[PDB]
Amino acid sequence: TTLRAFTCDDLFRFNNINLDPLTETYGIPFYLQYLAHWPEYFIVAEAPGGELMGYIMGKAEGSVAREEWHGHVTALSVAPEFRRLGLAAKLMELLEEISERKGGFFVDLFVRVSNQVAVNMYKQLGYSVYRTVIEYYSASGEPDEDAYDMRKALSRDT
Amino acid sequence: XXXXXXXXXXXXXXXXXXXXXXXXXXXXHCAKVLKAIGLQRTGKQEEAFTLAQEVAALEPTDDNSLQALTILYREMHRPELVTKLYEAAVKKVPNSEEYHSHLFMAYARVGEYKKMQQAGMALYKIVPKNPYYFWSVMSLIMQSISAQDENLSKTMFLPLAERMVEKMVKEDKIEAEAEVELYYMILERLGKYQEALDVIRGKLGEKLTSEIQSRENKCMAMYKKLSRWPECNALSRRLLLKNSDDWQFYLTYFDSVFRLIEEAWSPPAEGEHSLEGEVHYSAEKAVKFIEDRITEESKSSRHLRGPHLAKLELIRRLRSQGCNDEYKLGDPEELMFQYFKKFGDKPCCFTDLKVFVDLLPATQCTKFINQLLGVVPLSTPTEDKLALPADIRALQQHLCVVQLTRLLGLYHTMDKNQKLSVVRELMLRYQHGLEFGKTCLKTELQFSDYYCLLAVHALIDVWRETGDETTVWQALTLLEEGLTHSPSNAQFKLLLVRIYCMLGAFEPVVDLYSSLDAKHIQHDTIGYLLTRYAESLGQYAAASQSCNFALRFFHSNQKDTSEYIIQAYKYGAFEKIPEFIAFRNRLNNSLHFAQVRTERMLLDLLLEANISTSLAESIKSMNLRPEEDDIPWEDLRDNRDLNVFFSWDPKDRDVSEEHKKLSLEEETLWLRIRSLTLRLISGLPSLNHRIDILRLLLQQLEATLETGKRFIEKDIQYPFLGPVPTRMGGFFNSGCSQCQISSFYLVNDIYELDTSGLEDTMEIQERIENSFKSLLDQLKDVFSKCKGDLLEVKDGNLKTHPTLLENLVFFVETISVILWVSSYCESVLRPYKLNLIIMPPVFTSFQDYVTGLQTLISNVVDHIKGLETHLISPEERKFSKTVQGKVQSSYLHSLLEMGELLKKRLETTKKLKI
Amino acid sequence: MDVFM
């Protein structure tokens, strides 16, 4: 329901989404960089009466003619009263469609190796596994958690 | 290699960056002083500025010096000195691209919108590849969003920009993507919507295929603003045939179908039906489409909840016009029951049935619930127990039935015996709901946590309607048990923050706000829960840390969002630049920034003021001028969340727009009480060396202390999960408003005695005599209202008193003001006594008695002896001894800090005896 | 989810 684009003044309503232990808030230079540079990959979803169901950030930063023009996924979250609806597969489908439109060459992803929910979701969508970045997710005393770089190859094009 | 070796060693971390640069001064050209100075701007500003201003006037024209100085000036919140660099590199050399582009970026940094246009056009004249032409046109709207509501906003700035763009549309230098967005923004802003729709629908819209629906979402806005309904209905219908789930297009479909039977539309004989084709009319053409979307959704493996809600929206809108003519849509009770039968096991069945719950006939809310209970697969009731679910699919279908029983208004009809049996049932169901979800990965909600929240919103509902105080401890053990079982639920932590603050505890509140990780831009929407209760309950270290974190976020907001308005010209945004301007104004005009700023200055004053900082050297380090306020007062935002708490309340008692409006009014009144007190305090140094300004802040302060006192009599009842009524009602019960006003009158009388003299002023000296004796008799009456006992043991309960702790913070914040003003009068009477007769012997008695009162209040904050002597399912009987052991050990930590502050404030009365 | 900085 209501797959629109993440306007600023939705950084003040996305608090059923970012009060998760697995979802970060990134600061305001991060959100405004991803709103200025790549506003295509920044879909939010809204329920009948507000209640932001869940956003998806993302970028496409690489270099063509080295076969590395890839489209990232740099946040994905669904609010915990709106999960198991098929919303997260819808947002990943829209990011794969957008990053297939502007050329293509895989879609990457960074998921920590603690949650079998997200990893066993990306295995089922089609994402294979690439290298495991060691001590990637830093803190915020808590230990550093490794990250499965995940890559899904789609519709090879320069 | 003198520029690469010496600089890369000058950026190591902090001091190897600094010592190797400081050694690079006697070793060797135009920027060695700047590279040596830029790494010592940590705390000392003048030792940096004595070479910053020395090197910013030598015509640098180097990339290293300018690139370092545009960081050094930006980090000190002074961008106005950046613009004077690059034009100093322009008036010496007319560079092609670099210095002119940096000069344009410096102008966009500082905000000079009327000066950025000339630089952009000059840079277009020098090297015209084609983004520099449209930077000047974007600045030509930057100087039209600032000066709005004028003839010189749409007759001088925007049509000039439209002509500036249309000079390139006649030619062919438009071949890009951001320029069509800019031309549509200009044609929309001017009011030419008919000319703006055709630039999308024509040839320049085909280059607009960058976002998902950036063409059919920019045609819809024009189809609405032109009041062109059949070309809006057909576009919304053609976008519903693609997703059949978008709620933003079911709304426009219904809005522009019922207006087409309001306008009595008839189709043309030729054409398809309109510019988008196949336009529907009302009822039959709009009922068959929804009853087709339901059927086409029924043949998929996804189970969309789009058309099932569209049926209910259509049956509310057909009812909103004519209710006697019904076609085939059926009763809304059967539709809501079938929607529960399909989407029951999902967590979003309530938040979709909440909006359509007005459709029920308001008397069958107890038959609809008994109809919904018949389909949940529950077990057999009478095995000397309760009727329990058996799956997780049949637990969520019962949790949604309990939530809908709450929303329909059935847990607010009972009378506190059924309303405790409901809590007993919803705790048995929570204790059974932990058999499922035993192997959860600790970052998920256990599956039945909302059986605990529905047994806490029904305990606080009993406490707020009887005043029981034996149910607050029960709700706290429920939330502590639910938080030790699923220690990542954030509703438990937010409710624990709220209940622990409403009892008077604040050590668990800072340990629970650090747990839910509130990072940048949560400090504006959840941080009010700490700022309001932090310094109010006597926790001064936690208040200092909370104000420091929020101030760090808001100042980093100012600098970083100016930088990312600069960095949205370079990537060709041109449609987010008014959005980023509105975002900066929402986060600089915010209410929580003003509260954190004035409470940080008042905490700095009453912690490092007349203890160990001189109130005069303490004001100069904060730039408090008592003739200027940096608070907007007219665009106060109030962007606090207020809906971060899940509330299943019956929609006529939760957070209306009236409660949000009254809450903004009350925070503005208490902020005007706080800022005026701060500005009146900051005039007392700078009073001894005008009173014409500090006599007008008193007339404003006694006006807002009457507006607040007439606001408190308007007896408003905020709900529990609502907006948190302020200390203003506790500022007048504990009489401390008049106890500070009767001192700001005393500084007024002492100044008139100072400018007159002790020669023929026997009418002023008697008034000062009668003002000392009446200022102390109010300080003895705050004490009689703050004298009590913070924890009792009455009939086996605890009965915490937080009012006797808030009236004990309002006493320290009052005698701090009294000892500032009394330190001013010592600075007046002591040169008169040294110059050498009736009135200083009453100042000596006032001074010898306020010490004898501060000793009494520093001995009633030996409640530590009275609190340390409290000895005070079986796992629920264990968490009571942790909840009460948290409330007691937070009262003890509050009284420790207040007694430690008064034992330093009593020593300042040894510098006032004269 | 990426790292914060």
Ligand SMILES: CC(C)(COP(=O)(O)OP(=O)(O)OC[C@H]1O[C@@H](n2cnc3c(N)ncnc32)[C@H](O)[C@@H]1OP(=O)(O)O)[C@@H](O)C(=O)NCCC(=O)NCCS
């Ligand atoms: C919560 C989250 C699962 C989103 O849910 P979602 O997008 O609605 O998932 P979908 O309904 O679209 O389905 C995707 C698959 O995920 C799997 N899945 C989701 N939750 C699951 C759970 N608790 N247990 C097992 N599998 C689960 C399912 O197998 C599902 O397949 P299905 O359609 O056959 O049911 C997860 O994506 C999320 O957003 N977590 C918060 C942020 C995060 O954890 N990771 C960000 C990735 S770096």
